[PDB]
């Protein structure tokens, strides 16, 4: 085993990616070629990609193939391809391995211009769209908005030309649901990546000042429980402290961070004054809780202190509410976890251990003292112990670092790490322990990466310098070792490192490249083939690389100041290392103030790129195969290793007053200047540039342009005012000059408002660096948006707040709903092609509101079309067994009608791919010759008989009638004979309770009849059979007494059947009634029984069928028992179909299509015909359910309003505003499939 190979590949191929596959071979000395290929699995038939690589001494027998599985070459369709063959071929070896493939190429980042929207806003959204190589994907993206109901709302697809997809603005539907909307982005075509973002649709006003609640730390224990200092700070978004304000604190005992009875602590509700923008507070849990509640101690409350804070400006109309959702009362506050700690030993290398300490509601606690103690197990369990080292966690990292000098004898280390929490016992200072295992080399042929715990991030363009030592018995033979550098899934670099003469080996000196910047993984491996046996020896380490952007886009404004002034014309300069697209967004910092901790949209985007790393942990591994697997690789080798044993759980180790503007995308050819006027908001504009170029995404530095005016009015106009309510529009005049001023504030308003003061006015004065409370009382007369000009006539001219008051009508806004399921083919009965929604003005409408109406439609997709067919071996039925005597003729021809019907009901006469039964003309000839042969069996008085002169059989007559009714849809036949035979069967053989009682045929012809149950319900069987026949034929001769007879027989079935003795009878009678009143309560009871006689396999049923009397133990060959079982199953199936219950049907079609489950073939006629029938029907149903329904919606007195082109590609009806007073019509053609249209009426009732 000297001649050996390793081919190293990403653990998973990404479709459309380029997978760099590297091959090394050992002990060859003649040059040879190998080809590496990706081939379809399992057939190896299609070569998706192939690479020819030359292995030779100047290659050093090392090379790689760039293989790409182009997405359109995979077959696609209903099944994705889960696997593919990686194959290598050479003069010396061939091997192929089943590789998994993933349809998950690239990244979708959804950038939403604000986290929060009022209604009536449009949410501007764009998606940054990157290939697996972090290049512009140029793939069109489907972008789906989910209302917190979870209902699909809208879908929009936009071509990606740029790597930036500027979607149309999504206008919030005219009655949204408040709360967390979801946006899902998916690539339209092959790749099935997803992006997701959230935005909150909420009634809000931008808070004026950022009230900040900053507890010393997020937990309360014995130290704090008596005394817990908590700091309030409030700053305006123009970042000057709220110089004075009234602070209101209120406290609650919250059992969980849930909607709760907060149990507010009136004992502790407190006031303080916000001295220069700060107020230190403390809560004493003792006096608060014992004075108010039973709880004596946090032993009783492993719970949360809720705190809410109201800051009122005290000299102004603004007030802001801040909260902490809860501070954890805890006996044991902390928990340990490891970070970047492999849990794998390198005997003789200092073993670094890093524990982070997290508190409850975890944050890094920073300064907790930690001690680590461990037991060292040497070979043969020779156990020993280490002294307990101590370290304090790093204050700004939470990490207590440890290093254990381990003897080279250690086989496993198990070590415990405990919080030396000074204020706790160990019984509350939680403690943890871990196993660390050596590499488990078989030969003891080890390789170690001498990585000096350099967790400090490496800098792009610096040379790496990693020492590696292959300590091996056979270093005489280990000429060289190989290395691979991994970044995301890709092997970005590979190479070889000679043994120097001294038996030192070359360092890995390669420079760290820009393709490494999120992270990299170094794997190092060699095969040594000492004695006659090869060992693959390998190691890997996690490499932490700086998040250096490739384009390094930076954005700054050209002027600079403490603050710009409202409307100041300003230049924005974008400067970049290369040509770049850049997307700009300015938002008011206030908008994040709407929330607590609202994360900037593209936070930590490198930490999302990191998620394409296929490895996990800081490196190392239990074994060579484990080292490769944890590195996110797999390999082909003959060196006595494979990683197919290495399957594992998913690995979780850790290592004008706009609100937004400048929403623009520009080509910045290395430099560009924008000019614009800063809007009138006196706020910090956080301006975010995001660069996109051939080197990926670079979210830049968030410029924070302070907009500031020395002296101004700001008005606390609420979001909305109730129409016709006297309300104080409170506000504040601010003077930040050092001199005081005398000011007059006045309100100028449109006539839709009437106002009190009507001032030149009182001309009040305000001190320097101070603000005066201003207020106006107003009454809004009429609904809508009304311009109010607040203005401040004062030294240095004027100020004028052009504002809009928003007025909503009185009472309560009520919403109530109507819809219809449009079933234009009768998929459920009555043809619901059209519906009309009258403009029903309610009796209690508030005097002048408008009734809002909103319409939407949902397509009801058919789902899983489980597809099953007769073989072309149905030529067996076309060319059936001899047309002999003893009704053998009938058995011959009857199935031909069914098979003709089946072929009619489908593509079979649109197309045969093979073995065609296409000569439908000859088939129709044989069909009508059949109908002749059966009509031969008709006796004189329109009975049928088994023989030309035999005893008239009602069973046979109903059977014939069934056949003839079924076929009359395809061959016209003299209905008078059908009328006569029907009225014969009714008048001669109807009797009450026991309808259609059979005239003695002297024998059951078991080849044609079933063998019923004989003792009882034989009559229920026969009534069911005859009712089926009549229901199949009465439609072509609807003589009234035949309907009366159907009433009689259906009533008798409904009454007699429910206590069914036999599943067979239950089934058949269920069917018969399904032909009749599908919706009679008795019918539904019988159905509900049948559905419980059903037998299944699988937790969700994969197969479902019915059996009775154990006629199933003998299923090895088709026989009367299996015949009966198939019969009763096909009746059940038919029934279900008539219920149109596809979800039920499907596993019954799956059972019926597996011949083996009922002994192979069919036995007798009945089973066979009923099975063919059922497959026919099921085909039919699936067609009828196929959604293709252009739905007209039109007003009654006016033009069309919308046209929903509903299709299974586009099943979702965007909500359409239906605000006009017309009666509203919705209609569709014959169309196809099933939809449901909903109109919601929203109205205010007194």
């Amino acid at each position: 085993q000297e001649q050996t190979y390793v081919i190293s590949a990403p653990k998973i191929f990404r479709v459309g990616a380029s997978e760099n596959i590297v091959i090394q071979v050992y002990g060859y000395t003649e040059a040879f070629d190998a080809t590496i290929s990706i081939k379809s699995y399992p057939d190896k038939k299609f070569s998706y990609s192939s690479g020819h690589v030359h292995l030779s001494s100047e290659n050093k027998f090392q090379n790689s193939a760039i293989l790409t599985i182009q997405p359109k070459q995979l077959p696609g369709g209903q099944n994705p391809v889960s696997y593919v063959y990686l194959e290598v071929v050479s003069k010396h070896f061939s091997k192929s391995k089943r590789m998994p493939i993933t349809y998950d190429n690239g990244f979708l980042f959804i950038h939403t211009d604000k986290p929060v929207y009022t209604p009536d806003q449009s949410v501007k959204v764009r998606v940054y769209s990157l290939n697996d190589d972090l290049k512009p994907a140029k793939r069109e993206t489907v972008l789906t908005f989910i209302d917190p109901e979870g209902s699909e709302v809208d879908m929009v697809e936009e071509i990606d030309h740029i790597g930036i997809i500027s979607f149309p603005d999504f206008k919030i539907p005219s009655n949204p649901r408040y709360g967390m909307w979801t946006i899902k982005a998916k690539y339209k075509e092959d790749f099935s990546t997803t992006g997701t973002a959230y935005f909150e649709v909420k009634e809000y006003v931008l808070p004026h000042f950022s009230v900040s609640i900053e507890p010393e730390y997020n937990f309360i224990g014995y130290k704090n429980f008596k005394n817990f200092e908590i700091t309030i700070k409030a700053r305006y978004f123009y970042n000057k402290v709220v110089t004075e304000a009234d602070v209101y604190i209120t406290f609650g005992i919250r059992e969980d961070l849930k909607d709760d009875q907060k149990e507010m602590m009136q004992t502790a509700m407190q006031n303080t004054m916000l001295i220069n923008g700060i107020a230190q507070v403390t809560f004493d849990s003792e006096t608060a809780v014992k004075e108010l509640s039973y709880y004596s101690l946090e032993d009783l409350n492993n719970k949360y202190l809720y705190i809410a804070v109201t800051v009122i400006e005290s000299t102004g109309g603004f007030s802001e509410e801040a909260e902490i959702p809860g501070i954890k009362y805890v006996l044991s506050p902390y928990k340990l976890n490891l970070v970047a700690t492999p849990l794998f030993l390198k005997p003789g290398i200092p073993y670094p251990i890093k524990v982070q300490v997290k508190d409850s509601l975890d944050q890094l606690v920073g300064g907790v003292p930690v001690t680590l103690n461990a037991q060292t197990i040497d070979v043969n369990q020779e156990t020993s112990d280490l002294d307990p080292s101590k370290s304090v966690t790093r204050v700004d990292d939470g990490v207590a670092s440890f290093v254990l000098n381990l003897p080279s004898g250690v086989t496993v280390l198990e070590f415990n790490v405990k919080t030396d929490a000074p204020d706790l016992p160990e019984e509350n200072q939680a403690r943890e322990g871990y196993r660390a295992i050596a590499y488990s080399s078989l030969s003891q042929s080890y390789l170690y990466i001498d990585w000096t715990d350099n967790h400090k991030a490496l800098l792009v363009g610096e040379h790496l310098n990693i020492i590696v030592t292959p300590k091996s018995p056979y270093i005489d033979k280990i000429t060289h070792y190989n290395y691979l550098i991994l970044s995301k899934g890709k092997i970005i670099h590979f190479g070889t490192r000679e043994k120097f003469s001294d038996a030192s080996y070359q360092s890995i000196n390669i420079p760290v490249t820009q393709n490494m910047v999120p992270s990299s993984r170094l794997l190092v491996y060699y095969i040594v083939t000492g004695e006659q046996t090869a060992e693959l020896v390998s190691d890997s380490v996690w490499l932490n690389i700086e998040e250096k952007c490739g384009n390094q886009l930076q954005v700054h404004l050209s002027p600079d100041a403490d603050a710009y002034s409202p409307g100041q014309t300003v230049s924005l300069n974008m400067a970049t290392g290369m040509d770049s697209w850049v997307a700009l967004a300015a938002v008011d910092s206030a908008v994040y103030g709407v929330q607590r901790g609202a994360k900037k949209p593209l936070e930590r985007v490198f930490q999302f790129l990191e998620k394409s790393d296929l490895g996990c942990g800081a490196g190392g591994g239990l074994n060579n195969a484990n080292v490769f697997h944890l590195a996110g690789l797999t390999f082909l080798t003959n060196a006595n290793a494979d990683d197919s044993q290495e399957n594992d759980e998913p690995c979780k180790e850790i290592l004008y007053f706009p609100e937004s503007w400048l929403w623009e995308v520009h080509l910045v050819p290395r430099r560009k200047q924008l000019q614009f006027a800063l809007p009138d908001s006196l706020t910090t504009w956080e301006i975010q540039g995001v660069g996109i170029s051939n080197t990926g995404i670079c979210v830049a530095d968030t410029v924070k342009a302070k907009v500031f005016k020395d002296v101004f009015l700001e008005m606390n106009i609420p979001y909305s005012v109730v129409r016709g309510e006297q309300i104080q529009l409170k506000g504040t005049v601010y003077n930040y000059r050092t001199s005081g001023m005398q000011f007059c504030v006045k309100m100028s308003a449109v006539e839709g408002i009437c106002t009190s003061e009507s001032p030149k006015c009182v001309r009040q004065k305000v001190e320097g660096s101070s603000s005066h409370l201003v207020t106006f009382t107003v009454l809004p007369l009429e609904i809508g948006l009304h311009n109010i000009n607040f203005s401040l006539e004062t030294w240095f001219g004027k100020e004028i707040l052009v504002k809009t008051l928003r007025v909503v009508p009185e009472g309560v806004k009520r919403e109530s709903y109507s819809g219809v399921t449009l079933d234009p083919r009768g998929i459920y009965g009555t043809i619901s092609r059209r519906k009309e929604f009258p403009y029903r003005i309610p009796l209690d409408l508030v005097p002048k509101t408008e009734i809002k109406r909103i319409l939407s439609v949902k397509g009801l997709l058919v789902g899983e079309i489980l597809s099953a067919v007769l073989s072309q071996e149905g030529i067996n039925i076309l060319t059936h067994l001899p047309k002999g005597s003893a009704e053998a003729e009938l058995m011959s021809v009857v199935p031909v009608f069914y098979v003709f019907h089946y072929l009619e009901t489908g593509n079979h006469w649109n197309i045969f791919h093979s073995d065609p039964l296409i000569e439908k003309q000859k088939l129709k000839k044989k069909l009508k010759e059949g109908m002749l042969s059966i009509m031969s069996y008709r006796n004189a008085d329109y009975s049928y008989s088994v023989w030309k002169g035999g005893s008239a059989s009602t069973w046979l007559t109903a059977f014939a009638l069934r056949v003839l009714g079924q076929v009359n849809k395809y061959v016209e036949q003299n209905q008078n004979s059908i009328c006569n035979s029907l009225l014969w069967l009714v008048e001669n053989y109807q009797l009450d309770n026991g309808s259609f009682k059979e005239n003695s045929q002297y024998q059951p012809i078991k080849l044609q009849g079933t063998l019923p149950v004989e003792a009882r319900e034989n009559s229920l069987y026969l009534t069911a059979f005859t009712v089926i026949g009549i229901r199949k034929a009465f439609d072509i001769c609807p003589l009234v007494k035949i309907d009366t007879a159907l009433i009689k027989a259906d009533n008798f079935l409904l009454e007699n059947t429910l206590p069914a003795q036999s599943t067979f009878t239950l089934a058949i009678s269920a069917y018969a009634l399904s032909l009749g009143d599908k919706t009679h309560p008795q019918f539904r009871s019988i159905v509900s029984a049948l559905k419980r006689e059903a037998l299944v396999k699988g937790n969700p049923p994969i197969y479902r069928f019915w059996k009775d009397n154990l006629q199933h133990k003998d299923s090895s060959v088709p026989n009367t028992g299996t015949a009966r079982m198939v019969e009763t199953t096909a009746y059940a199936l038919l029934t279900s179909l008539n219920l149109k219950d596809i979800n039920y049907v499907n596993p019954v079609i799956k059972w019926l299509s597996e011949e083996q489950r009922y002994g192979g073939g069919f036995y007798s006629t009945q089973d066979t015909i009923n099975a063919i029938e059922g497959l026919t029907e099921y085909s039919l149903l699936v067609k009828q359910l196929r959604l293709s329904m252009d739905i007209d919606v039109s007003y009654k007195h006016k033009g069309a309003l919308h046209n929903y082109k509903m299709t299974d590609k586009n099943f979702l009806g965007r909500p359409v505003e239906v605000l006009l007073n017309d009666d509203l019509i919705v209609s569709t053609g014959f169309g196809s499939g099933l939809a449901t249209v909903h109109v919601t009426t929203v109205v205010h009732k007194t």
Binding site: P148, G150, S151, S818, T821, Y828, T1079, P1081, P1100, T1236
Partner: protein, 49 residues
Amino acid sequence: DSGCPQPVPPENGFIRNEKQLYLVGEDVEISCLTGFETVGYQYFRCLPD
């Protein structure tokens, strides 16, 4: 998944589109037995809860 179980229909109603589990936002359509007729909003919206 916490998709809603099959609801109890109104008396004399039945579930048109019976399913063992309904995805969030599925309409389940109530319909009335032969003697009876749906007056109102026959559809229940399976909420994420």
